[PDB]
Amino acid sequence: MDLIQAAYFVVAILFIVGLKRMAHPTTAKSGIVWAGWGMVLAVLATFFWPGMGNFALILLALLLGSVVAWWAAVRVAMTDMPQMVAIYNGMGGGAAATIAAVELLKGAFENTGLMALAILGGLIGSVAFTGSLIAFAKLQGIMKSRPILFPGQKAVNALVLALTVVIGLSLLWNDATASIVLFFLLALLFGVLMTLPIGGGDMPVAISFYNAFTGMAVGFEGFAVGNPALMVAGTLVGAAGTLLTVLMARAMNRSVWSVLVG
Amino acid sequence: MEFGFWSALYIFVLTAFLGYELITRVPVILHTPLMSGSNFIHGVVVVGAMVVLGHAETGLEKLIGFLGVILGAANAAGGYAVTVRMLEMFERKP
């Protein structure tokens, strides 16, 4: 507990300084390096979580995802870097949801307010996930670039979101394993629906928006389960990410709401 | 929030103020690399997914916890790689 605490703490200082340095011209190159060590320290230190098992599945999954991902990033043309940022972002959010989802269906929550936090992070995660994939698809030409519009869409979107929130709250009284898969389907479903109307040209602001969204997703997820490394880094990026989205929109001589709609 | 409700709320808001604050005064040329690095940083989701996986029973929990770690690992690995390549655009040639 106390050496993990100590490690995860130094990890925050490494992400804070790293993010701090990524933001200034002379110091940008080191920033990613500092944050890098942050990750390393964090990934090692978490091996010593008490009650830790399934190590083969763990080593498999770290190895599988980290390498295939690295492989892709290195081969891609500089011209496709926006969608790469998108798709790695999506999966960050998917992870936020998986954390939520597992804990939710061991119903491992005593505090119902923590449960609520977890569910909120699940919803936001799931949205970022499929939201960032639609973004990718569009850039890659796998889908229509321009706003995918239809009859009374505004209403169907609000409706799914409303339905999702609602059946989400449901898990506080009844946490039936059927309600959980429904909750996530709807959260993933609302992810896609949210981004159909977003034009390819606005995609930089959508992606910055989803980046804020998964950051927030993971900070919430971190508070719900007792994990400081997520709590800090999560909200650090959620907060910096929303500001970034404002500045990116401003720069593109246009507004965030506009991006979201048609 | 957790580990002292007030304790945690102070952390939440301070971290949020601090995060927001570091990014003010960022230049335009650094927008997207900043996005990539911050995207890389929420790559710590692995750590959380890792713990979910480590304690998983029921097998469903292992499956979905297994995906969690893959997804989380690519976010960190891929985000790191991508940020590094963007930063190489600023560099001269000889």
Side-chain angles (χ1 to χ4, degrees), chain A residues 194-218:
Chain A
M194 229 200 107
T195 135
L196 280 351
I198 299 173
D202 298 321
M203 221 71 235
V205 171
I207 295 154
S208 187
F209 187 79
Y210 291 146
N211 192 56
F213 258 34
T214 119
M216 275 191 288
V218 343

mmCIF file of all heavy atoms in Angstrom, chain A residues 194-218:
data_model
loop_
_atom_site.group_PDB
_atom_site.id
_atom_site.type_symbol
_atom_site.label_atom_id
_atom_site.label_comp_id
_atom_site.label_asym_id
_atom_site.label_seq_id
_atom_site.Cartn_x
_atom_site.Cartn_y
_atom_site.Cartn_z
ATOM 1 N N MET A 194 -23.520 10.390 -31.790
ATOM 2 C CA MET A 194 -23.078 11.723 -31.462
ATOM 3 C C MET A 194 -22.222 12.290 -32.553
ATOM 4 O O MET A 194 -22.162 13.507 -32.721
ATOM 5 C CB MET A 194 -22.241 11.718 -30.197
ATOM 6 C CG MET A 194 -22.657 12.765 -29.198
ATOM 7 S SD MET A 194 -21.310 13.077 -28.063
ATOM 8 C CE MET A 194 -20.800 14.683 -28.670
ATOM 9 N N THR A 195 -21.548 11.422 -33.292
ATOM 10 C CA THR A 195 -20.504 11.892 -34.192
ATOM 11 C C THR A 195 -20.853 11.830 -35.702
ATOM 12 O O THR A 195 -20.186 12.511 -36.519
ATOM 13 C CB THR A 195 -19.143 11.251 -33.847
ATOM 14 O OG1 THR A 195 -18.500 10.818 -35.047
ATOM 15 C CG2 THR A 195 -19.305 10.083 -32.931
ATOM 16 N N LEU A 196 -21.899 11.063 -36.059
ATOM 17 C CA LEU A 196 -22.402 11.035 -37.443
ATOM 18 C C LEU A 196 -22.498 12.417 -38.000
ATOM 19 O O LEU A 196 -22.090 12.630 -39.113
ATOM 20 C CB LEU A 196 -23.787 10.406 -37.563
ATOM 21 C CG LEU A 196 -23.962 8.885 -37.582
ATOM 22 C CD1 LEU A 196 -22.652 8.137 -37.680
ATOM 23 C CD2 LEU A 196 -24.687 8.439 -36.340
ATOM 24 N N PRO A 197 -23.032 13.375 -37.224
ATOM 25 C CA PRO A 197 -23.249 14.692 -37.812
ATOM 26 C C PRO A 197 -22.009 15.547 -37.942
ATOM 27 O O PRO A 197 -22.099 16.643 -38.516
ATOM 28 C CB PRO A 197 -24.226 15.353 -36.832
ATOM 29 C CG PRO A 197 -24.792 14.241 -36.018
ATOM 30 C CD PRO A 197 -23.647 13.297 -35.890
ATOM 31 N N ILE A 198 -20.876 15.056 -37.428
ATOM 32 C CA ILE A 198 -19.633 15.823 -37.389
ATOM 33 C C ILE A 198 -18.862 15.709 -38.712
ATOM 34 O O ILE A 198 -18.546 14.616 -39.159
ATOM 35 C CB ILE A 198 -18.780 15.390 -36.182
ATOM 36 C CG1 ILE A 198 -19.564 15.658 -34.905
ATOM 37 C CG2 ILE A 198 -17.461 16.153 -36.112
ATOM 38 C CD1 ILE A 198 -18.891 15.115 -33.667
ATOM 39 N N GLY A 199 -18.577 16.851 -39.337
ATOM 40 C CA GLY A 199 -17.857 16.875 -40.608
ATOM 41 C C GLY A 199 -16.401 16.509 -40.426
ATOM 42 O O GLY A 199 -15.818 16.776 -39.375
ATOM 43 N N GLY A 200 -15.818 15.895 -41.453
ATOM 44 C CA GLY A 200 -14.393 15.555 -41.465
ATOM 45 C C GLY A 200 -13.482 16.737 -41.168
ATOM 46 O O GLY A 200 -12.491 16.564 -40.471
ATOM 47 N N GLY A 201 -13.824 17.932 -41.665
ATOM 48 C CA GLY A 201 -13.014 19.144 -41.477
ATOM 49 C C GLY A 201 -12.955 19.641 -40.034
ATOM 50 O O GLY A 201 -11.973 20.290 -39.598
ATOM 51 N N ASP A 202 -14.002 19.316 -39.280
ATOM 52 C CA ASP A 202 -14.086 19.670 -37.866
ATOM 53 C C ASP A 202 -13.474 18.627 -36.941
ATOM 54 O O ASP A 202 -13.473 18.787 -35.710
ATOM 55 C CB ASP A 202 -15.553 19.883 -37.504
ATOM 56 C CG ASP A 202 -16.164 21.017 -38.282
ATOM 57 O OD1 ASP A 202 -15.441 22.025 -38.479
ATOM 58 O OD2 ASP A 202 -17.339 20.886 -38.709
ATOM 59 N N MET A 203 -12.920 17.572 -37.525
ATOM 60 C CA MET A 203 -12.570 16.398 -36.755
ATOM 61 C C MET A 203 -11.483 16.673 -35.665
ATOM 62 O O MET A 203 -11.585 16.148 -34.555
ATOM 63 C CB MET A 203 -12.230 15.236 -37.703
ATOM 64 C CG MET A 203 -12.794 13.901 -37.240
ATOM 65 S SD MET A 203 -14.600 13.766 -37.393
ATOM 66 C CE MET A 203 -15.067 13.342 -35.713
ATOM 67 N N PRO A 204 -10.482 17.540 -35.950
ATOM 68 C CA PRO A 204 -9.505 17.956 -34.921
ATOM 69 C C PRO A 204 -10.107 18.413 -33.592
ATOM 70 O O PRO A 204 -9.540 18.136 -32.531
ATOM 71 C CB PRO A 204 -8.812 19.145 -35.567
ATOM 72 C CG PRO A 204 -8.865 18.826 -37.019
ATOM 73 C CD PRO A 204 -10.192 18.167 -37.254
ATOM 74 N N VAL A 205 -11.239 19.120 -33.652
ATOM 75 C CA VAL A 205 -11.931 19.589 -32.454
ATOM 76 C C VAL A 205 -12.753 18.463 -31.833
ATOM 77 O O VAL A 205 -12.770 18.293 -30.617
ATOM 78 C CB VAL A 205 -12.775 20.830 -32.760
ATOM 79 C CG1 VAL A 205 -13.676 21.191 -31.588
ATOM 80 C CG2 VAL A 205 -11.851 22.005 -33.084
ATOM 81 N N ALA A 206 -13.395 17.650 -32.652
ATOM 82 C CA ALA A 206 -14.041 16.455 -32.104
ATOM 83 C C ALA A 206 -13.061 15.553 -31.351
ATOM 84 O O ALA A 206 -13.355 15.057 -30.263
ATOM 85 C CB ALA A 206 -14.710 15.669 -33.204
ATOM 86 N N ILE A 207 -11.894 15.330 -31.934
ATOM 87 C CA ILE A 207 -10.909 14.441 -31.330
ATOM 88 C C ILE A 207 -10.395 15.044 -30.005
ATOM 89 O O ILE A 207 -10.247 14.344 -29.019
ATOM 90 C CB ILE A 207 -9.764 14.156 -32.332
ATOM 91 C CG1 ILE A 207 -10.306 13.372 -33.533
ATOM 92 C CG2 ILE A 207 -8.614 13.397 -31.679
ATOM 93 C CD1 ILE A 207 -9.500 13.573 -34.806
ATOM 94 N N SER A 208 -10.156 16.353 -29.984
ATOM 95 C CA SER A 208 -9.695 17.044 -28.767
ATOM 96 C C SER A 208 -10.742 16.967 -27.677
ATOM 97 O O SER A 208 -10.417 16.937 -26.487
ATOM 98 C CB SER A 208 -9.399 18.521 -29.060
ATOM 99 O OG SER A 208 -8.819 19.145 -27.935
ATOM 100 N N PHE A 209 -11.997 16.964 -28.124
ATOM 101 C CA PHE A 209 -13.189 16.860 -27.282
ATOM 102 C C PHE A 209 -13.291 15.502 -26.628
ATOM 103 O O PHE A 209 -13.545 15.410 -25.421
ATOM 104 C CB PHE A 209 -14.420 17.088 -28.160
ATOM 105 C CG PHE A 209 -15.708 17.171 -27.416
ATOM 106 C CD1 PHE A 209 -16.065 18.339 -26.759
ATOM 107 C CD2 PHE A 209 -16.594 16.114 -27.428
ATOM 108 C CE1 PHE A 209 -17.277 18.444 -26.098
ATOM 109 C CE2 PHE A 209 -17.802 16.206 -26.761
ATOM 110 C CZ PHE A 209 -18.144 17.373 -26.096
ATOM 111 N N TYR A 210 -13.110 14.458 -27.443
ATOM 112 C CA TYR A 210 -13.062 13.076 -26.945
ATOM 113 C C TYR A 210 -11.830 12.766 -26.069
ATOM 114 O O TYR A 210 -11.878 11.928 -25.156
ATOM 115 C CB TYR A 210 -13.175 12.090 -28.098
ATOM 116 C CG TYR A 210 -14.536 12.086 -28.741
ATOM 117 C CD1 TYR A 210 -14.670 11.872 -30.100
ATOM 118 C CD2 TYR A 210 -15.703 12.262 -27.986
ATOM 119 C CE1 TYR A 210 -15.920 11.860 -30.706
ATOM 120 C CE2 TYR A 210 -16.952 12.253 -28.582
ATOM 121 C CZ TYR A 210 -17.060 12.049 -29.943
ATOM 122 O OH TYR A 210 -18.297 12.022 -30.557
ATOM 123 N N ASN A 211 -10.739 13.465 -26.321
ATOM 124 C CA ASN A 211 -9.586 13.353 -25.467
ATOM 125 C C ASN A 211 -9.874 13.850 -24.039
ATOM 126 O O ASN A 211 -9.636 13.148 -23.054
ATOM 127 C CB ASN A 211 -8.434 14.101 -26.098
ATOM 128 C CG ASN A 211 -7.137 13.809 -25.423
ATOM 129 O OD1 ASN A 211 -6.737 12.654 -25.309
ATOM 130 N ND2 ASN A 211 -6.477 14.857 -24.941
ATOM 131 N N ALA A 212 -10.404 15.053 -23.942
ATOM 132 C CA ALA A 212 -10.985 15.532 -22.695
ATOM 133 C C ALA A 212 -11.942 14.497 -22.087
ATOM 134 O O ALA A 212 -11.902 14.201 -20.884
ATOM 135 C CB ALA A 212 -11.728 16.842 -22.941
ATOM 136 N N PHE A 213 -12.806 13.954 -22.929
ATOM 137 C CA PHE A 213 -13.794 12.974 -22.483
ATOM 138 C C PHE A 213 -13.189 11.702 -21.893
ATOM 139 O O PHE A 213 -13.723 11.197 -20.898
ATOM 140 C CB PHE A 213 -14.742 12.587 -23.628
ATOM 141 C CG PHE A 213 -16.090 13.237 -23.568
ATOM 142 C CD1 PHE A 213 -16.249 14.530 -23.081
ATOM 143 C CD2 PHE A 213 -17.205 12.556 -24.049
ATOM 144 C CE1 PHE A 213 -17.501 15.122 -23.050
ATOM 145 C CE2 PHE A 213 -18.455 13.141 -24.022
ATOM 146 C CZ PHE A 213 -18.605 14.429 -23.523
ATOM 147 N N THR A 214 -12.115 11.155 -22.475
ATOM 148 C CA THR A 214 -11.626 9.888 -21.903
ATOM 149 C C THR A 214 -10.780 10.196 -20.657
ATOM 150 O O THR A 214 -10.889 9.494 -19.652
ATOM 151 C CB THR A 214 -10.983 8.871 -22.900
ATOM 152 O OG1 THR A 214 -9.620 8.611 -22.561
ATOM 153 C CG2 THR A 214 -11.092 9.317 -24.308
ATOM 154 N N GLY A 215 -10.017 11.286 -20.689
ATOM 155 C CA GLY A 215 -9.326 11.754 -19.483
ATOM 156 C C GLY A 215 -10.260 11.792 -18.286
ATOM 157 O O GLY A 215 -10.027 11.133 -17.248
ATOM 158 N N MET A 216 -11.337 12.559 -18.457
ATOM 159 C CA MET A 216 -12.396 12.647 -17.461
ATOM 160 C C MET A 216 -12.883 11.243 -17.121
ATOM 161 O O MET A 216 -12.919 10.862 -15.950
ATOM 162 C CB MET A 216 -13.547 13.504 -17.973
ATOM 163 C CG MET A 216 -13.370 14.998 -17.767
ATOM 164 S SD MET A 216 -14.927 15.853 -18.132
ATOM 165 C CE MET A 216 -15.118 15.765 -19.924
ATOM 166 N N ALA A 217 -13.222 10.460 -18.145
ATOM 167 C CA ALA A 217 -13.636 9.065 -17.933
ATOM 168 C C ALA A 217 -12.728 8.359 -16.960
ATOM 169 O O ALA A 217 -13.230 7.747 -16.015
ATOM 170 C CB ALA A 217 -13.683 8.290 -19.229
ATOM 171 N N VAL A 218 -11.405 8.463 -17.159
ATOM 172 C CA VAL A 218 -10.476 7.693 -16.318
ATOM 173 C C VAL A 218 -10.299 8.309 -14.945
ATOM 174 O O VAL A 218 -10.139 7.583 -13.986
ATOM 175 C CB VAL A 218 -9.082 7.386 -16.934
ATOM 176 C CG1 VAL A 218 -9.052 7.575 -18.437
ATOM 177 C CG2 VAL A 218 -7.976 8.208 -16.308
#
